[PDB]
Enzyme design. Structure first.
Site, mmCIF file in Angstrom:
data_model
loop_
_atom_site.group_PDB
_atom_site.id
_atom_site.type_symbol
_atom_site.label_atom_id
_atom_site.label_comp_id
_atom_site.label_asym_id
_atom_site.label_seq_id
_atom_site.Cartn_x
_atom_site.Cartn_y
_atom_site.Cartn_z
ATOM 1 N N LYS D 155 0.617 8.011 0.199
ATOM 2 C CA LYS D 155 1.367 7.986 1.432
ATOM 3 C C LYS D 155 2.840 8.168 1.136
ATOM 4 C CE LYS D 155 1.899 4.260 3.477
ATOM 5 N NZ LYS D 155 1.885 2.974 4.224
ATOM 6 N N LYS D 157 6.675 7.544 2.608
ATOM 7 C CA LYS D 157 7.486 6.793 3.557
ATOM 8 C C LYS D 157 8.585 7.744 4.002
ATOM 9 C CE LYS D 157 8.917 2.784 2.008
ATOM 10 N NZ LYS D 157 8.940 1.354 1.543
ATOM 11 N N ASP D 186 4.007 7.341 6.694
ATOM 12 C CA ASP D 186 4.310 6.077 7.338
ATOM 13 C C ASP D 186 5.756 6.256 7.735
ATOM 14 O OD1 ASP D 186 4.607 3.422 8.174
ATOM 15 O OD2 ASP D 186 3.518 2.627 6.444
ATOM 16 N N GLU D 212 0.982 7.117 10.220
ATOM 17 C CA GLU D 212 1.197 5.700 10.411
ATOM 18 C C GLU D 212 2.512 5.351 11.116
ATOM 19 O OE1 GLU D 212 0.389 3.737 6.812
ATOM 20 O OE2 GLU D 212 0.683 1.721 7.606
ATOM 21 N N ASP D 237 0.741 -0.029 13.020
ATOM 22 C CA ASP D 237 1.035 -1.064 12.041
ATOM 23 C C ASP D 237 2.025 -2.057 12.641
ATOM 24 O OD1 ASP D 237 1.669 -2.765 10.082
ATOM 25 O OD2 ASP D 237 2.327 -1.282 8.597
ATOM 26 N N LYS D 261 -3.040 -6.242 8.246
ATOM 27 C CA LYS D 261 -2.173 -7.020 7.380
ATOM 28 C C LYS D 261 -2.321 -8.470 7.787
ATOM 29 C CE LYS D 261 1.328 -3.438 6.617
ATOM 30 N NZ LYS D 261 2.769 -3.079 6.693
ATOM 31 N N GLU D 315 -4.083 -0.036 1.162
ATOM 32 C CA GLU D 315 -2.861 0.255 0.433
ATOM 33 C C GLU D 315 -2.524 -1.038 -0.307
ATOM 34 O OE1 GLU D 315 0.013 1.208 3.383
ATOM 35 O OE2 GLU D 315 0.053 -0.815 4.252
HETATM 36 MN MN LIG Z 1 2.922 0.668 7.618
#
Ligand SMILES: [Mn+2]
Ligand SMILES: [Mn+2]
Ligand SMILES: [Mn+2]
Ligand SMILES: [Mn+2]
Lengths: 360, 360, 360, 360
Positions: D155, D157, D186, D212, D237, D261, D315
């Site tokens: 992924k 960022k 993300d 994401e 998320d 999470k 992740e």
């Molecule tokens: Mn995230």
């Protein structure tokens, strides 16, 4: 094997308790069997786009020609063909499907209710429209109808006078009758939502059991709103001008009750299609009428007999309005109901002399 | 006249081209006439809450007892009764309504399609599920089926392997076949919306004609979304577990195509109720199957014959999967179609010896 | 370590205060420990697609075989497996998950409520269905139940008689009892929206605390409407036939209260999944029952004990309806509640002799 | 039996591959057993309203005091209590529930995954955030991670540089890697819908597997819109800050994927509540992280192990970012996965010396 050889659409004016016009259908089959049906409306064009004149004109010029030579036993194919060849014309189509079902019933010696699946009852509750336009007169007629055990469900046709006047009238009648009879109204699209908002509340707060077509079919959102806000349930009648209209309304939540009229749908099979949709949505049923004579009334009744449930009964009182019929068998009204014979077809035969008499 | 005297639910395991289990129904009527039906599923409980074992158990213990003594000719009353006495159990109900319709067809000497209204066609397009699990093999089987003019519409059961693998497989097959065949997929609820989003686009961008049940029936909004975003039309199958489910989906706009399976609805009359709703909403039709033998396949076919239109044909290929049958009449597959005889009832008779043979 | 060695599904008919049929489950583990569960319904197929016969048939033929050899301690894996192998069959699944949880509780010496997270209470309020069908009789029974401090919450099963009759009955009872007891109704889907519209208002205007499943689960929009218009809160029961159904309803705003029945969800863990969803949406809870015996009632209770709050209590009165049990420990009903022991598992042991006695 | 005697919240700064701060929790029970947990965030207050300082402050001052004396074995009651006493504080709550679950696992000698129901797998796919900020470097790191078979899912960022720059970067990397690796992004809420509209299309058109949190949680309608229009699936998320947020989003159709999470939900049990809701709606799952060390990572992993399916893996790479750990057992990363031992509790023990070393 049996084929459709000829179809006759005859306009007949009958005296009432003031004339009532019906379009009698006679479908002659190659096997000697003949079915009779009826395409009837109220007031020429005031209650539908199909008048007696327009009905006979189109059957003669379009619908009938498309059926001659076709298998009389294949009603579906025939009716589907009529749908491919003609838009709307449900009244005309209804008379024809009724006649085809009648003819097919005599041929197999089975009553139409059976052709349609099988009856779950032998009679139907019948409501009575009190129409004298005189409150005292109406209450008397109600008490009388209760007396002779002919009707215990009454509907008032309103919306033609100021809202307050009809409200008073209707509430006075219910007040007076109490729990001895069910009182409903039919505003026939006469009110606009802004008028219905208050009337519906008052009616529902004063024992009115249901409110039939308060506002016009042109205001869909208003129907959805009133179906949400009326203390008394909203029933859709004029809003349904076809089976697809029924789906549309059900998908919208425009009415918790659907009136079932073969004329507005296209015949006995068509009205069951609408009813089927209503049952799937959880919408309540009611056997409606366009004030048909015994033929149309029996065509309707035979279909309504197969219905699991008709929460609000029927208004199949059409024949009691006529002082003369074109069929020999008189309708069986006893103990708030219309009794349907198990005889083949519609269980009716034409009174040839009277037919010739009143045929215009 | 005639009554239901005894109903037999027989579990039969048949060899395939690997067994296939059907629950054969035999309803014997007081008039000597006997109807046969079939309640068949795939994999015990993996494709429905009704297993062969549970089906026979409930027919024996509940459904059948409620029908003995009842008029065999009043199918509606009987089936409505089954609905008042039992929730769901559409498979079991379908086998029974099928048998009742068969028995009623022989009794009146009319084919079931006619009992159901009248056929508008004499055959149905039949799709073929390519199952070799091998792309090259599948393409070979497709060309073979095209050669002998048996199938020109093929579906691929996917969703069991990684999305890319199935995508590759399916796109490879379509690419290879070109416009000589129609290629569809059935993911059987195997994907979740997040997986379907990309796959549906790819499939639709590579000539896949329709996408059958991409995601699970538990995700209603996802179906509505994909019915709005898929380049290829979305068909609902597993999502429909009843006629009311069909209305629900149509009211939601969850699929532009409805697969029609008598088993998932409750029989031939029930599947037409769902089809009627689809026609009213403007939803396209498809004749589905649970891989029934000739009895269930013919019960389905006789119903699909009355349908005005079946835009995506049918997948009534069930009988070609079996190397042995429990009926004498072999299915008529010629020129991409299943041909249905005009004979009375389902047009089938039990092969008593084989019945005794494979009955478990 | 411990494995599932054998599972027995036993149909047991017990006398009530008139028989009640339960499917007792016995899961034998390789470590000597045995768990007991219960899959119980009401009236064969009238309250669910799962009958006692169909339940035992599928456990024996499908569910149980898939579990033998599996780790008895891995309930999740086992139950997830049952979901991959079988559609629906929540009743059968519930009895099995209940037995697995019982067996796992004895093995770890922890009560099931603890296995499920930990109880936040040691007893549950228990409502009582007044069923005599006689108003005076019901009011007497209510006064009696209040006297002996057994019940102070009563529900009336209605919808089987004319709307006005049930309304009268129910309002008369509340009127008579006043603020000394809470009165609720359960229409069990018997009304159609058009009937519920007025009844719900009347009930809510006459002190009825909540209206359980007024209309059928087939009318989703009507539930959403009544959840918006009923003066009295609407509770969903039959509408929930799974955890995903619970989400669906919550996402729709179809009910401000969810009844929690392990049978309709798939077991104690499954009912908590539904409850979890309800808590997330802000929907109120109620401990429901299918009239289980002590085993099913205790399986339910142990789950309900972990619930933060159950605004409308529970109707875990199932065992008081039976004059005989198949477990040794009698249910603890004192001061409007069911008291749950901290003992391991469900805290129940089979009364072997009675089991053999009533096992059909 | 066992009680919570004392809870310690220790702020620990660890070196990374640049410090990473975790709040280590130690709950000591009266039975000698001690559980360890972890409440970790990224950047003080930049990724959540809970900083390491605020976390320790509230545990010490509020959460912990409320638990001393309580049964260590009744996790539900304890956690429910924390919810009645404190709004939010999911991170702090997550560390505590993690520690309680660890302590309860050692006490019963069962791994936490089992306490949570039972694992359906023994390892989890682990994605890797390519952070070099250099396209060429990132592609090199990707191929390296593929070589040693550590990661095959990567992924990026993005959202911190101009849209085109990040687009180029991300598309360049995917193009270069081809089908050898899955590439996701993300955006961490960095884009506003107007920017996401084009980027999402480009990314989805260039093989990016999922997007994401493209836009901010403050724009709910935009998420619903992108979940409908993005060629690539949208994952929520930051939008989920609680279990109720998960329901809200699912009810809205704001994302076809939910990142899981424990920190954002309130612990392992809380994350499963969110996952259960996602499964009920048909939403896809992903094991998320706040870059926890082995304790938080293992607490997450033990929960994710019970999940039926995690379409997009996890992740859980947090521990590989640290060059030093405060637990003795090194994380098991082999063949694109994190392998979880069957040992009791989290399977971790504190490295007392290092704890004392890095504890700030
Ligand atoms: Mn995230
Ligand atoms: Mn009207
Ligand atoms: Mn399918
Ligand atoms: Mn209930």
């Amino acid at each position: 094997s049996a084929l459709i050889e000829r179809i006759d659409a005859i306009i007949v004016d009958l005296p009432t308790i003031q004339q009532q016009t019906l379009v009698v259908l006679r479908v002659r089959c190659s096997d000697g069997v003949e079915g009779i049906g009826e395409a009837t409306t109220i007031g020429g064009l005031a209650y539908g786009y199909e008048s007696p004149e327009g009905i006979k004109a189109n059957i003669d010029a379009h619908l009938a020609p498309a059926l001659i030579g076709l298998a009389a036993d294949n009603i579906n194919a025939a009716m589907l063909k009529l749908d491919a060849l003609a838009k709307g014309n449900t009244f005309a189509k209804s008379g024809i499907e009724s006649a085809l079902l009648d003819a097919q019933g005599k041929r197999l010696g089975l009553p139409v209710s059976e052709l349609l699946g099988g009856r779950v009852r032998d009679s139907l509750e019948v409501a009575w429209t009190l129409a004298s336009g005189d409150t005292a007169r109406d209450i008397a007629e109600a008490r009388h109808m209760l007396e002779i055990r002919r009707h215990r469900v009454f509907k008032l046709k309103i919306g033609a006078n100021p809202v307050e006047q009809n409200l008073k009238h209707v509430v006075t009648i219910k007040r007076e009758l109490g729990d001895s009879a069910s009182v409903r109204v039919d505003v026939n699209q006469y009110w606009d939502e802004s008028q219905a908002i208050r009337a519906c509340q008052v009616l529902g707060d004063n024992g009115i059991d249901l409110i039939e077509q308060p506002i016009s079919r042109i205001n869909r959102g208003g129907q959805v709103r009133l179906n949400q806000r009326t203390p008394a349930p909203i029933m859709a009648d004029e809003s349904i001008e076809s089976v697809e209209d029924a789906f549309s309304l059900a998908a919208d939540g425009a009415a918790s009750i659907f009136a079932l009229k073969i004329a507005k749908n296209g015949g006995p099979r068509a009205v069951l299609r609408t009813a089927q949709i209503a049952e799937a949505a959880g919408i309540g049923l009611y056997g409606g009428t366009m004030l048909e004579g015994s033929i149309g009334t029996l065509a309707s009744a035979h279909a309504f007999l197969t219905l699991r449930q008709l929460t609000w009964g029927t208004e199949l009182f059409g024949p009691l309005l006529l002082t003369e019929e074109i069929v020999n068998e008189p309708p069986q009204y006893r103990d708030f109901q219309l009794h349907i014979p198990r005889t083949p077809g519609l269980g009716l035969t034409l009174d040839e002399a009277r037919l010739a008499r009143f045929a215009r």
